[PDB]
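INPUT
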Amino acid sequence: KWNRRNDMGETLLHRACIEGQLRRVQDLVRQGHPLNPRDYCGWTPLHEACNYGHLEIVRFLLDHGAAVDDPGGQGCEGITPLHDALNCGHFEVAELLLERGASVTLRTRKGLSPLETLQQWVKLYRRDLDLETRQKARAMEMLLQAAAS
Amino acid sequence: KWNRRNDMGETLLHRACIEGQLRRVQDLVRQGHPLNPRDYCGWTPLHEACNYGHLEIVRFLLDHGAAVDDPGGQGCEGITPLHDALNCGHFEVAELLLERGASVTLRTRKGLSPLETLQQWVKLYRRDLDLETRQKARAMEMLLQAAAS
Amino acid sequence: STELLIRKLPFQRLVREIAQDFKTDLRFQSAAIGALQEASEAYLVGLFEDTNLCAIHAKRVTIMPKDIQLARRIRGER
Amino acid sequence: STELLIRKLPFQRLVREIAQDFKTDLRFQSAAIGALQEASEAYLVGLFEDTNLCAIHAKRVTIMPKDIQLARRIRGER
Amino acid sequence: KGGAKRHRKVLRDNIQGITKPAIRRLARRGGVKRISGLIYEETRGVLKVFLENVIRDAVTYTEHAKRKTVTAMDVVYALKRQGRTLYGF
Amino acid sequence: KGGAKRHRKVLRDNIQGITKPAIRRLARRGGVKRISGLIYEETRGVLKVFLENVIRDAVTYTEHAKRKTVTAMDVVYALKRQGRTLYGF
Amino acid sequence: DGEELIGDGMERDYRAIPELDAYEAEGLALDDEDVEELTASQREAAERAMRQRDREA
Amino acid sequence: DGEELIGDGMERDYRAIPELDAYEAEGLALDDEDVEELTASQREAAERAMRQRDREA
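OUTPUT
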């Protein structure tokens, strides 16, 4: 009944938290969706939200569900939402995902781990980062490292 | 599809040419009805029209169909429309039924024949008949008698 | 309220009357009447749901014969 | 006009694509595709008739998604 | 100036046994909040047709079973033939 | 001030092969005189669901027949199971 | 231009009426004698007959 | 607020397009080898399986 998609396998919930429409996401989530639906690549509406964040969209989302730790659908290389958020450097969102749950041992195996993902993100963007950005990344970097312990 | 009735088995066409609504009969006949439908006693919409006539209703009716000679459904004692019209002394209607068809040999067997029916009608109403009525009945009476020949 | 829908006794007599002009001298197992009654009731209750949908489509809260008619046609009845 | 409805070739490829994520290495008899195409077309043509009825009920000549939706619901789809 | 003999009429009444209260009860169960006055008549007609179709088939089964007693199973087959599913009988 | 890696997306396009002309042709055959713009999308979704349900069942038949070739009869049974009658196959 | 189904006094629609709330014996089978269901042949036959009944209507 | 299906130029919707108007060989069976339909047991089995598939959805 609820699951019918566009030609990428994208549910109606996906599109809202893709384009980051909060007044849409809200209204839709009301009646709206079985969660962890996987589009044709295997992502979930929380991936999209984390990936684009859309901080105040992912807050509405992580509320309901939960759905907060979702692995990869095959072919999408097994990327958790925190992995995704660390790939997109949305730290306020990465911080949000750490409350209400966390995968931090996830070691998502693109060959890498959550810290390694952030580290490779930093390495790649080393020049071009703000002061504030460099600092958000340091916090997060010491925080993840002290997670495994 | 078209045949569904009241608790007497009366079709929508019946009711119109019962109550003698011409603007109804007209509009309904347009799309309207498979003819010779028999109500629970076995009458037909032409019986009703003849029986009540409603001269200008039976003219609209005898046009389409035809359906103009319809015997009895069982239990209704095998009364043809002319038999019916002669029971109700509608002579203008009885005259109409004689053009566009006639049963005149019908001998409908309530035990009686078309002439005998008129004759028994006259006999029963002997006093109370008009001059004009007495004359319409004489015409009709000599006309039927000279039918069998 | 109650799960009461159609009264049993009039429903029974309704069934016998209809049966009678197909065949005479028939009798019924009670379960057969029960079967007819349950099916009749499920049928009408379901129909009223479709009917209600047709009314709402026309922006009406009051259901009407034309709503029942639309529902039956779409359900493939004649 | 013609009895043309859906073009054969895109319909065939449409069927293979859908079949593919249920099972791989499948092949089809042509008649099987033909069967799917005829059923699909009868299904949609019939649906448009019900849809048209729903539009008219709302006093519209222009059919709309909500008309298709009503028709499908009454037909018992999900 | 004459007179008339009207038609004898035959009454089959029992469909009125589906009463206004019965019909309200059905409509309520169907989620209906408000009905027009013509709904009562319409519902009787619709049920009458329904029963006539199902009982006609059922009675036909009973005949082919060479008996005069209609059984729950006869009705079940009739219902199935008329496109309706019934469980428990 | 950082950057992002967007999601790889997987496209299944073939439903667009039910084109606007095809859809007009179907609607006309259905007696429809006028359509809203959203009708095209809606029709694709509806057909997609329909085929997905029928082909899923059909493929299941083909498997239980221990073969990789789908037959017209496999489709016929699938259609029957999904509440649709097809003659000639 | 219609009537409300839900309101004060709808409860009168649900009162128990013993004489109407059960089936009566009349029209029911007269005894407990065994009743045989249709044999597959008899069923197939009846449906054949009804198929033809319909074909002529 | 909609588009007319019947009018000048609807005929362009019905033109013949040879390359689209037939099925291609790809995806079709590779040869004329005999293909056995479902045995009654196989059909009953498949429907049993689908019944359970549905029961869990």
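end of record. Chains E and H do not touch (no CB pair under 8 Å).
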